[PDB]
Amino acid sequence: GPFQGQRQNEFDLMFVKEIFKNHNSNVVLSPFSVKILLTLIYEASDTSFGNTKRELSSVIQNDNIDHTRSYYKQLLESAQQDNKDYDLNIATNFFVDDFIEVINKYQQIANTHYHAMLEKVSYSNPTQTAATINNWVSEHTNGRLREIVTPDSLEGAVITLVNVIYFCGLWTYPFPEVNVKPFYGTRGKPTNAQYMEQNGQFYYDNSADLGAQILRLPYRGNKLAMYFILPNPDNTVNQVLDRINSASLHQALWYMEENEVNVTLPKFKFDFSEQLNEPLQQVGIREIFSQNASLPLLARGEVRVSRIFQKAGITINELGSCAVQIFNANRPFIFFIEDETLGTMLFAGKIENPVF
Numbered sequence: 001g002p003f004q005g006q007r008q009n010e011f012d013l014m015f016v017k018e019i020f021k022n023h024n025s026n027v028v029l030s031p032f033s034v035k036i037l038l039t040l041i042y043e044a045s046d047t048s049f050g051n052t053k054r055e056l057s058s059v060i061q062n063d064n065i066d067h068t069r070s071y072y073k074q075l076l077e078s079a080q081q082d083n084k085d086y087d088l089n090i091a092t093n094f095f096v097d098d099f100i101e102v103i104n105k106y107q108q109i110a111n112t113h114y115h116a117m118l119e120k121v122s123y124s125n126p127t128q129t130a131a132t133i134n135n136w137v138s139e140h141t142n143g144r145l146r147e148i149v150t151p152d153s154l155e156g157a158v159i160t161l162v163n164v165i166y167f168c169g170l171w172t173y174p175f176p177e178v179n180v181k182p183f184y185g186t187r188g189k190p191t192n193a194q195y196m197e198q199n200g201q202f203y204y205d206n207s208a209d210l211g212a213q214i215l216r217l218p219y220r221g222n223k224l225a226m227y228f229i230l231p232n233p234d235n236t237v238n239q240v241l242d243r244i245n246s247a248s249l250h251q252a253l254w255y256m257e258e259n260e261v262n263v264t265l266p267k268f269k270f271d272f273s274e275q276l277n278e279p280l281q282q283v284g285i286r287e288i289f290s291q292n293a294s295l296p297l298l299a300r301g302e303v304r305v306s307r308i309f310q311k312a313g314i315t316i317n318e319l320g321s322c323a324v325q326i327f328n329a330n331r332p333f334i335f336f337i338e339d340e341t342l343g344t345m346l347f348a349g350k351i352e353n354p355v356f
Contacts, residue, residue, distance in 0.1 A: 002203055002216060002225070002256070007343040010246050011035060011058040011283075016348045017241050018279040020334075024187075028272045028314045028349035033090050033163045035059045036072060036114055037276070040092070040161065041288050041305055043109060044298030052287045069113040075344050076115050078223070085221030086169040088346070091140035092116035094298070095133055095160040097123050101300040118298075123158065126151035133162060137311070141166040144323045148273055148311045157306035159295070165312045167337070167347070168322040169219040173200050175265075175318035183266060184331045185353050186236060193266040193354050195330070196318050202261045204325055207252040210243050211235045214256055215263065215327045219320065223341055226316070227253070228265070229334040230327060237332050237350060264328040268354035271313035280308070314349060317356070 012031030019027055038059045047053045048065060061068040079088050093116060096102055102118050110116040119136075121129045130151040138146045141164050148162060175196040182190040203216035213230040231240050277289060287293065294302035315321050321337075329351075337347040 001340070002253070003338065003340045003343050005343055007246065007250060007338075007345070008058075009249075009343070009345055012345040012348070013244055013246060013249065014283055015279065016345075017244075018283050019274065020237070020241055020350055022279065025352045026268070026270045026272065026350065026354070028270065028312045028347060029274065029310055030090070030163070030165045030312055031345040031348055032075065033092070033165055033310060033346075034276065036076075036090070036092060036116070037161055037163055037308060037310070038280075038285065039068065039072060040094075040110060040114060040116060041295070044106065044295040045288065046294055046296050049297070055285050055287050069109075073113045073115075075339070075342055078342050079339050079344060079346055080115065083221055083223075086167070086219055086224060088165075088167045088169075088224070089140060090115060090163070090165050090346075091137075092163045093136060093161070094118040095121050095129065095162065096299070097121070097158050100158070100303060103298060103300055106298045123154060126154050129154055133160070137162065137164050140164060141313070144313050145271055145311055148309055153275070153307070153309075158303050159299075159306055161305055161308045163308075163310040165310075165347070167314070168320070169221075169224055170320040170322070171318075172218040172220055173198070173202075174320075175263075177318045181330065183354060186332055191353055193330075194356055195264055195266050197262075197264045199260065199262045199324065201258050202263065203256045204259045204261050204327065205252070205256045206232075207255070209248055210240055210252050212240050212252075213327050214252060215261065216256060217263075218340075223339055224337055224346070225340050226321070226335060226337050228327070228329060230329045231331070231333065233331075237334060237352075240334065260324045262324050262326040262328070264326070264330065265316060266329060266351070266354040267315075267317050267356040268351060269315045269317075269323070269356045271311060272349075273309065273311040276308040276310055312347065312349075314347060315356075
């Protein structure tokens with residue numbers, strides 16, 4: 001069933017707020033994947049060997065590196081492993097400059113434990129490099145996501161870390177294939193959306209603390225599930241996010257139990273990209289972007305992470321995400337997909353205007 005442990009999501013939730021605060025339409029990203037990226041710079045940084053460690057607190061596992069590696073390796077494999085019911089891949093890669101001598105063992109670390117690689121490109125040619133990064137993005141998302149950077153976004157870069165994510169998943173309980181109705185966006189008149197409607201047994205409650213309805217829709221495979229947080233009429237997404245912290249969400253999700261529910265949801269199909277450097281500095285991770293920031297365990301002796309990118313695609317429709325109480329989500333909502341056997345926040349997103 002639903003996850004019964006304590007979600008290690010102090011960072012995850014904080015970071016989703018930063019992103020969501022600063023974006024006026026649909027957003028979709030992967031907290032868990034950002035913690036991988038941050039953990040890779042960490043292993044590359046000198047402070048691990050034996051300020052950056054203090055700032056990478058809620059991402060690094062109790063200052064002992066073998067635990068950090070098996071924690072992330074186990075959580076990556078829990079979600080990514082081959083199965084009948086869903087496909088999920090979390091692809092990650094350092095695009096390092098020709099001139100840099102990459103340490104081969106760092107390569108091995110990244111490959112084995114974090115499921116990531118390192119690959120030489122020449123930034124002297126922006127047009128080549130952008131095409132090599134954008135093609136890689138396609139080749140590890142079965143061409144669902146095809147472009148993540150432009151030559152312009154690689155200005156004066158030395159090392160560029162990219163994260164993408166892909167996910168195919170089938171609802172345990174499909175919606176009948178039928179129905180356009182209004183959607184009440186926060187800014188501007190009601191836009192029309194195509195909805196899907198069904199009634200069934202789902203985990204549900206109306207959170208008084210959060211001021212929102214919450215709905216869990218499981219995917220086939222006893223591992224993944226999509227949760228929806230739908231603000232009451234009297235409050236916005238912003239106001240709910242303020243009310244969300246590790247503990248209040250834990251408790252909101254804890255209170256949920258199986259009811260009959262009348263589920264009305266808007267179909268949507270959209271992806272999203274962002275530069276992590278800015279929203280990372282805002283939440284506290286500064287030291288790795290400073291003029292000192294070194295990568296001596298990644299690059300042979302200094303250099304730093306020029307830029308970091310993440311992109312994710314998501315869909316909901318009658319069959320899934322592939323590419324009586326009434327929970328009628330015809331206004332902006334929040335959503336996340338998690339590994340229900342581990343607590344992992346694999347996706348987190350937000351609907352402001354659903355197009356399909």
